[PDB]
Structure formats: C-alpha cells, structure tokens
C-alpha cells in the first residue's frame, strides 16, 4: 500500500545517501589545499548600458561574445553591441512581464518568457528589416523562469509548473516534458554538449535531465531553500547552484555529490544568478545585497566583489571567450566588467 | 571622428532607438498600474467586468483621461514569493474579498474558512516587503448576498468574540474593520475600503478617486513635504 511504497522510497534514499558517503573519500578543499590561490580579482566597469527604464530580469550573451540580449519589465528586449554600447535592436514584448531571455547560438533568434506562460521566439534576421515574433510556444501552466536554445529549432524552457519542456519551434509543440520536480523550476543550464541540462527548483533540488530520453538521471538536494540560479561547469561534468540559502554549491555529476559550498557569514541575502569563467576557476554569483561576488571555484575563499550596481543583481553572464562579464540589475543598468 | 560611415550610421540608429525607448517609457509612466488580487472567485472577475486561460490577464481601460492597466494574476497557481516582486512599482493593489464567504467553507479544505483565508492573503500582501508604500483598495464584493444571508446565519460563526446585532450595517463595518486592522503599516500606506455596488458603475469611480488620492500623496511624499 502507500506505507510500503513510502518505506521503499525512504530506504532507496538511504541507499543513495550511503553510496554517496562511501564515494566521498576526500573533499575538494583538501584536494586543492595546496594550489596557489587566485589573485585579487580587480574588475572595473568597462561598459555601462543605460537603455532600460525598468528592472532588468535576464541577460544573455551571443555566441560571438559581442552581442548581448537583455530583458526588462518595461516591456523591452534590447540587443546591444557590447563593444560600442550601441543598441542593435529594441523589441517591444507582447507581455511586459518577462523574467528570462535567451540568445540563439546561431544568433538568428532570441527568446523571451515570463508571467504570461508563453515563450516568444523572435526572428532577428528578417527581410522586412524588423524583428518579428517567429513563434509563441504555449503550453506551460506557470510562468517561464528560464529558456535556452539547444539549436535554432529546439528550445528548452523551465516554468513554475514544476516541469521543464523541450519544444520543437517549427511545429510549436512540446517534443518532451520533464516532470520530476515538486516545486517551481526557477533556473536552467544546458550542458556544453547540449545533451544534458540541469534544472534547479524551489524544492531545493537540482535535477539532471537528458533531452533525448526525457528522464531525470540524477538529483541533488544539498540546499536549504529555493534554487534561484544554476550554471554548468565548462567541462560539463559539474555545475553550480545559487539559492536563497545565501550559499552557492558545486555538484559533480559523476560523483553525484556536492563538492564545495561557497558561503560567508557576512552574506545573508540570496543569489539571483551564478556563472563560471571560461576556465571554470572563478564562480561569479550575483547576490541580492547589490554586489556580485567572484569566488574561487577550487578554493571556497572569495576572490573579489563587483560593487557597480545600486540594486539587486538579477542576471549575470560571462562571454564565451571569457573576455567580459555582464551584470544586469534592478537599477536598469547592465554593466560590462573586465 | 575615427568612426567609419557604417559605425556612424549604427550610432545614429542607436540614438533613434534610445529616443523611442525614452518616449515609450515616459508614455508608460503616465499610466496607472493596478495589481488585482483576490481569493478564488471573490467577485474579482466581476470587478474586471465592471471596468472594461493561464498567466497574467491585463485589462487596459481609460477613465476621465486616466489610463489604468490592471493585472489580474489570479491564474498563476504558482509560488507567489517568486514573482510578486515584479509588481513592486504598482500604483495600487485592488484586493477583492467576497463578504458572502464569511460562512462558506473552503472547497479545497473543509476545515478552513474562506473569509479567514482572504484575511491571511490580505495580511501577507499588505505587510509584504515589496508593498510597503503601495496603497490597497479593498473591494468588499457581493454585499447584497451577504445582507440577505446574515439574517439566516450570524457572523459569529466566522468571527469569534463578535458582539454585534447581526444587522447588515454592523456586521459589514465589523468585517471592514477586521480587514483594515491587519495593516501593520498605517503611516506608509492607506487602505481605501469600498462595498461593491454591482448595479451602478460606482466601482470604477471609487478606483479613480482612490488612485487620484494615491497620486496626490505620492507627489507630496516625493516633494518631501510629508
């Protein structure tokens, strides 16, 4: 009956826990106790982008690491040229309430989702010369919290419906649906090989999904509160989560266990966004105390701070070539550090 | 300058983009943004009807040369803590409460009472860390039903220690006071309570008057006078 299945699930959880404990012969700190610490990271605001007139909720770099897309709840999706701070495009969204945006690796498309439960795919390169809504993927019963392009035709979205979805943009239908979460999925991170992706939810759980199969492979429950942000390690065999627990955590897929906890006593606010440097040595986490913190990934000590913003750092993104960092905030300014 | 012809044209295009953004933003700052909230039905839909499947439903209506954008977020059966901060800058929060729900019990939970639910929702939303300054326009709907039903069922079944005469006026005033006393910030914000008149169009007029007083007080606070 229900009791038997509950006890079976509990004993399976205990089995997984003891397997993890057996596999945890050493910690990351004692492995990297002798490595030279990263020097004090002094990053200066190289660029400032001032177009937005409301809180910026998400930004995403283009794969060329020069174009940027940022979404604000003024009802604007702006594509910037980060080198010249020029506004390449300004897209008026149908729904002003957007909390995510994505730039296609091809660069032809962008995506925007929010409280309207719809992921709008906008086609940037059109003969008419203006950005038009290529598609409106609907079917989520909750807000879209993150969307990511697998390629020009496939997209992956995470919603407050406690589920993720893989959509074929051409047909407009959900190719697959991932329903393992028990809370609002607040983040998403496609793997570099684009065959797996990790989704963190409000149930303090991050699940690794296979896009091709549609089944969760691993689950991670090291956090204490909502997982607001998640990002894959560059090699694809690890990822990092930021939560309202005021901590960041590094989980390794192969070890199926957390490796490092980036937490400080002076820090009590949540993490809106996390990201890695190109080498993976630096974890850049955007906190709610208006300051982004740059942590050494291998050693838990904090390398530096980015104190440019006067409000919560809502979005954080590193260029593919690793040259710059882009931090958006609720003060309506995105700032390109280097 | 050192900019080539195409770079100069791109800069000119960016300047035009900035001008369009500025014009759109200044046009948007001239519109009243009202966050519409309620528990279940609570006549909220009727309030939307008075003034005119999933996700936010935005109703845009003009009244006396003032443009209101009302955001009904009822459908978002999601975690409110993860998206309620999107409405930090709304002019006012129109909170609809069904009076007839005083005796009705929650369909979802038989133990829970619908009225005390709205009271819990109101306590969560008026004392929210994001809505410290925004004023709440309380809309007590279905006054006729409540007036007809209070005779059959006393209000004491919902509210303990209510020593009223079970007349419509006394019970309605007691409910209004009970909702208005949940306000733990009586200086920063004000609660404009109105008993919804379904027949007449006085609902949009009351919203307009409350919004004008919110605008006046916001101007006076920004000027630093009070």
């Amino acid at each position, epitope marked *: 009956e229900l009791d038997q299945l509950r006890q079976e699930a509990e004993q399976l959880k205990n089995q997984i826990r003891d397997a993890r404990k057996a596999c945890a012969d050493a910690t990351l700190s004692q492995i990297t106790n002798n490595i030279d610490p990263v020097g004090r990271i002094q990053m200066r605001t190289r660029r400032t982008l001032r177009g937005h007139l409301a809180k910026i909720y998400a930004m995403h770099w283009g794969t060329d690491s020069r174009l940027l897309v940022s979404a604000s709840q003024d009802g604007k999706l702006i594509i910037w040229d980060s080198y010249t701070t020029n506004k*390449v495009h300004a897209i008026p969204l149908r729904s002003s309430w957007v909390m995510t945006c994505a730039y296609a690796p091809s*660069g032809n498309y962008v995506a925007c989702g929010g409280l309207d439960n719809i992921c709008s795919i906008y086609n940037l390169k059109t003969r008419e*010369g203006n950005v038009r809504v290529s598609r409106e993927l609907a079917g989520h019963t909750g807000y879209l919290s993150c969307c990511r392009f697998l390629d020009d035709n496939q997209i992956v979205t995470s919603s407050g419906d406690t589920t993720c979805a893989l959509w074929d943009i051409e047909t407009g239908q959900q190719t697959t649906t991932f329903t393992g979460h028990t809370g609002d999925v607040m983040s998403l991170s496609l793997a570099p090989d684009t065959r797996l992706f990790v989704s963190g939810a409000c149930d303090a759980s991050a699940k690794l999904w296979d896009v091709r199969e549609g089944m969760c492979r691993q689950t991670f429950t090291g956090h204490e509160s909502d997982i607001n942000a998640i990002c894959f390690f560059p090699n694809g065999n690890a990822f990092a989560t930021g939560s309202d627990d005021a901590t960041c955590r590094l989980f390794d897929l192969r070890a199926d266990q957390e490796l490092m906890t980036y937490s400080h006593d002076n820090i009590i606010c949540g993490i809106t966004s996390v990201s890695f440097s190109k080498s993976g040595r630096l974890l850049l986490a955007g906190y709610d105390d208006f300051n982004c913190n740059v942590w050494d990934a291998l050693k838990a000590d904090r390398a530096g701070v980015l104190a440019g913003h006067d409000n919560r750092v809502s979005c954080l993104g590193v260029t593919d070539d690793g040259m710059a960092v882009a931090t958006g905030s609720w003060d309506s300014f995105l700032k390109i550090w280097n | 300058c050192t900019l080539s012809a195409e770079d100069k044209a791109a800069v000119e295009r960016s300047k035009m983009i900035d001008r369009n953004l500025r014009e759109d933003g200044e046009k948007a700052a001239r519109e009243v943004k009202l966050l519409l909230l309620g528990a279940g039905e609570s006549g909220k839909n009727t309030i939307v009807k008075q003034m005119k499947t999933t996700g936010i439903v935005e109703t845009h209506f003009t009244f006396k040369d003032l443009h209101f954008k009302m955001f009904d977020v009822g459908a978002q059966r999601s975690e409110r803590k993860k998206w309620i901060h999107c409405f930090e800058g709304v002019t006012a929060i129109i909170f609809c409460v069904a009076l007839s729900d005083y005796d009705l019990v929650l369909a979802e939970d038989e133990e829970m009472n619908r009225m005390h639910a709205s009271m819990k929702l109101f306590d969560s939303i008026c004392n929210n860390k994001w809505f410290t300054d925004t004023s709440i326009i309380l809309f007590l709907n279905k006054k006729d039903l409540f007036e007809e039903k209070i005779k059959k069922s006393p209000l004491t079944i919902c509210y303990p220690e209510y020593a009223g005469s079970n007349t419509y006026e006394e019970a309605a005033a007691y409910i209004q006071c009970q909702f208005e006393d949940l306000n733990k910030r009586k200086d920063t914000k004000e609660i404009y309570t109105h008993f919804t008149c379904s027949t007449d169009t006085k609902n949009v007029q009351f919203v307009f008057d409350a919004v004008t007083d919110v605008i006046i007080k916001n101007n006076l606070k920004d000027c630093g006078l009070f």
Partner: single-chain antibody, 231 residues
Framework: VQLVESGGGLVQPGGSRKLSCSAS????????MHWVRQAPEKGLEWVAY????????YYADTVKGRFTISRDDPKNTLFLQMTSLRSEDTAMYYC??????????????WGQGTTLTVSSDIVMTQATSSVPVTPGESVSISCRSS???????????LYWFLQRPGQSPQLLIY???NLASGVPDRFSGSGSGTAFTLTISRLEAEDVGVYYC?????????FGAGTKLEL
C-alpha cells in the same frame, strides 16, 4: 520586399524633375535610403543618401546643391528633387535600401530603377573587363582601392554587387567576405586591404553580368568600373 521608382522621362536641360520611390514589404522607417545612378552603358555612380529619420544626408559632389533627397516615412516613399539637370544627369536611377547596425547587410535590395534622359575621394579600379570565361571554370574578378579599406575596428568596407543584363543590381558580398543572404555559396570574397578578389566556384546561366566593387569606408561611396563576364 520591393522598391518601385517613378517620375523619370524626357526632360529639357536645366529643368527640374522629381523622382519617387515607393517602398513596400519592409519597415521603410528603419532603412537608410540611397539613390544610385547608372549612366547609359557605364558603371554605377552613387548620388545621394538619407538616413533613417533623416538625421544625416549626404550628396555626391557632382550633384551637391542641385539635388535634394527626402523621405516620407508615413507614406513609405523616397523623393529626389533635381533642379538643374545637366547633360551628365542622363541615367537610370536606382533606389537602394541599407540598414546599418552591427552585422547588418547594407545595400541589400535595389529598386528596379527609372530612366531620366535630358535633351541634347577613394577610387576603385577594376582593370579586368570582358572576361570570356566559360561555365564550370572558376573565375576571379579583381578590384583595387587607392586607400586601404581596412578600418581600425577590423571591418573592411568593400562590397561586391552583381548586375545581370536587363536587371537591377543585387548585393553579392558585404564587407569583403560576408556573403549576402539569398546568394549561392559559389561566390567568395577576399582581400588584403587594398586589392580584393571575388572568386566564383562554379558558373551558371545567371552568373553572367557586370560585377561592381563599392567602398563604404567614407562618403562619397565609389563604385569601380564594371567588370563584364561573357560565356
């Protein structure tokens, strides 16, 4: 998209004529607009340019002070008013659209053009002309610039256009190497910074025509003398 020109015809020398360019199928407001004239049996010559929103206007020194360019965005129309029509203003005028942002393709669509007959700077050189190459064999058209088109930002503003016989010119290569959308992969562009080559992998019946090299480094935009291809 389409741009249709009108208003041309026979005009006495010294008279005034107005050329109109009706644009449909694209956001005319976001596109800067050029007027480019081609003399009978001669190469292309840039005439005028008006930016989006009419912020900047440029004229060729040949027609500066005699031609006035304007745009009616609500009507989606482009106007060129010509006051003193000399004997050198006989030509077919093309209305070209160009949108300038990062990664855009200016000079993408060229109108059909209208004939205007009167009663009677960086220089681009294309020495090679009338190449008799046969289809199936790769051919390289060479063009040369007096001033280095390579810029500080790294963009080389050298455009390759193709004009098939009895047809409006069409964009082939933008910014030296970038290939225009809708253009067969057979075309490729390369250049050191002063001498550029356009190589055709294979030749078909539609590749025959006149190939022009334009510079967009600075105004006036200069077209090289056309390089003609014959089977």
């Amino acid at each position: 998209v389409q741009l249709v020109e009108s208003g041309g015809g026979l005009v006495q020398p010294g008279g005034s004529r107005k050329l109109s360019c009706s644009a449909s199928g694209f956001a005319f407001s976001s596109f800067g607009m050029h007027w480019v004239r081609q003399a009978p049996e001669k190469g292309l010559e840039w005439v005028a340019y008006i930016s989006s929103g009419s912020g900047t206007i440029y004229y060729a020194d040949t027609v500066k002070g005699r031609f006035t360019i304007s745009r009616d965005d609500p009507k989606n129309t482009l106007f060129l008013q010509m006051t003193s029509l000399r004997s050198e203003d006989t030509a077919m005028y093309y209305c070209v659209r160009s949108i300038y942002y990062y990664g855009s393709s200016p000079f993408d669509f060229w109108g059909q053009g209208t004939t205007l007959t009167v009663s009677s700077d960086i220089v681009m050189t294309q020495a090679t002309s009338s190449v008799p190459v046969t289809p199936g064999e790769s051919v390289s058209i060479s063009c040369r610039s007096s001033k280095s088109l390579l810029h500080s930002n790294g963009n080389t503003y050298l455009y390759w256009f193709l004009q098939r016989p009895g047809q409006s010119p069409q964009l082939l290569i933008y910014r030296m190497s970038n290939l225009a959308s809708g253009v067969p992969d057979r075309f490729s562009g390369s250049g050191s910074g002063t001498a550029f080559t356009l190589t055709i992998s294979r030749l078909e019946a539609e590749d025959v025509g006149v190939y022009y090299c334009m510079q967009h480094l600075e105004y006036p935009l200069t077209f090289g003398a056309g390089t003609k291809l014959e089977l």
